[PDB]
Amino acid sequence: TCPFYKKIPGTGFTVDAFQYGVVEGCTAYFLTHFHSDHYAGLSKHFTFPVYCSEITGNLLKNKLHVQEQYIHPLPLDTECIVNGVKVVLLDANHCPGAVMILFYLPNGTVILHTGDFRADPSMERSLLADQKVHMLYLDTTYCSPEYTFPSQQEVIRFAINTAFEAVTLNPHALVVCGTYSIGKEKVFLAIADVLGSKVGMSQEKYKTLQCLNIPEINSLITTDMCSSLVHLLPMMQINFKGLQSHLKKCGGKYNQILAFRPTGWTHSNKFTRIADVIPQTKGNISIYGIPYSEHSSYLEMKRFVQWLKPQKIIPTVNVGTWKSRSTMEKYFREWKLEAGY
């Protein structure tokens, strides 16, 4: 049974609600992004209208085989009428194709559903500038002040400089980058660009990347692993055993691996600057954990909410414990008292 924080009151609409069977009263199912916790339940047998971005619709058709007649892609930044209700899709600054949804309810209430997002000051000059929001359904993944991490630009600068130094010292070093979902493509694209290489990967991952509308993608990626010195592997293989095994397969082309694990936050963020990050090393293999986040930090979330001044907040993450719910409610009241709304 579908939980309350996935229903949009006053509509026939749900958000990210495909694992509950046929939801009573639902006439249109929105999908914010192509991450498995959110699409859980969708397949080629789905026969209700799915509303989403173009990129998400490419993934639904090619990866999950949902039939074309049920996929309803909408352009971004554009007022659209769906089943008699005005909606807008906004870029969420999460993974490719990820949106926030603005719903203009028939009674005059305005609702923002962030989906998953990484708040940014640029969102203060979107279509959100123009009107008031009564209800905010908020991605609260990192809603606590201990969750700190650098900008995505600082993280990429560290990765590019680290990879370029290692391979210039040793032209026979291979770079490997872990993946388990869409998102965080800039990690491996920026490294391959500084090295003058295409990125090599499995046929299954190539297919996924081909759905993302990335400019000049055919110039950037390949399934011919032997021609490439940046390889993508499943995240589960990014350990000394999996990497050893991979280096065997390369036919003595390489004699060293430098590997990256983009994580979200880890507690080593509580002590260490990005600049001071060091790898784990065993022989000719080194592994870096890099804090590349596609979710808001505490400070970025607080800024966004203090700007938007919603009348009510409904969290969509960390909702399963009373302690998490109480913590999040305390910070919402601080923010409101401090800013005066």
Q: What is d(CA 182, CA 34) in angstroms, rounded to the nearest whole number?
A: 8
To the nearest whole angstrom, how small is the minimum distance from the Cβ of residue 52 to Ni ion?
A: 14
To the nearest whole angstrom, how small is the minimum distance from the Cβ of residue 268 to Ni ion?
A: 23
CA nearest neighbour of 296 among 278, 308, 312? 308
Residue range at the interface with Ni ion (CB under 5 A); choices 31-39, 187-195, 203-211, 255-263: 31-39
Q: Quick one: which H or E segment has residue 262?
A: strand 256-263
Decide: 292 and 188 in contact? Cβ < 8 Å: no
CA nearest neighbour of 187 among 227, 216, 152? 152
CB closer to Ni ion, 116 vs 300: 116
Q: What is d(CA 47, CA 49) in angstroms, rounded to the nearest whole number?
A: 7
CB closer to Ni ion, 98 vs 287: 98
7 is a contact residue toward Ni ion (CB under 5 A): no
Size of the site for Ni ion (CB under 5 A): 2
CB closer to Ni ion, 118 vs 231: 118
Residue range at the interface with Ni ion (CB under 5 A); choices 69-77, 116-124, 194-202, 283-291: 116-124
Residue 25's contacts (CB-CB under 8 Å, 6 or more residues apart) are 12
Residue 171's contacts (CB-CB under 8 Å, 6 or more residues apart) are none
Query: In this chain, which of 6, 7, 35, 198 binds Ni ion, going by CB under 5 A?
Result: 35
To the nearest whole angstrom, how small is the minimum distance from the Cβ of residue 233 to Ni ion?
A: 21
CB closer to Ni ion, 27 vs 152: 152
Residue range at the interface with Ni ion (CB under 5 A); choices 84-92, 108-116, 263-271, 279-287: 108-116
Phi/psi of residue 119, nearest 5 degrees: -55, 145
DSSP states along 92-156 = -SSSTT-EEEEEE-TTS-EEEE--S----GGGGGSGGGGS--SEEEE--TT-STT-----HHHHH
To the nearest whole angstrom, how small is the minimum distance from the Cβ of residue 244 to Ni ion?
A: 31
CB closer to Ni ion, 35 vs 261: 35
16 is a contact residue toward Ni ion (CB under 5 A): no
116 is a contact residue toward Ni ion (CB under 5 A): yes
Which residues contribute to the site for Ni ion (CB under 5 A)?
A: 35, 116
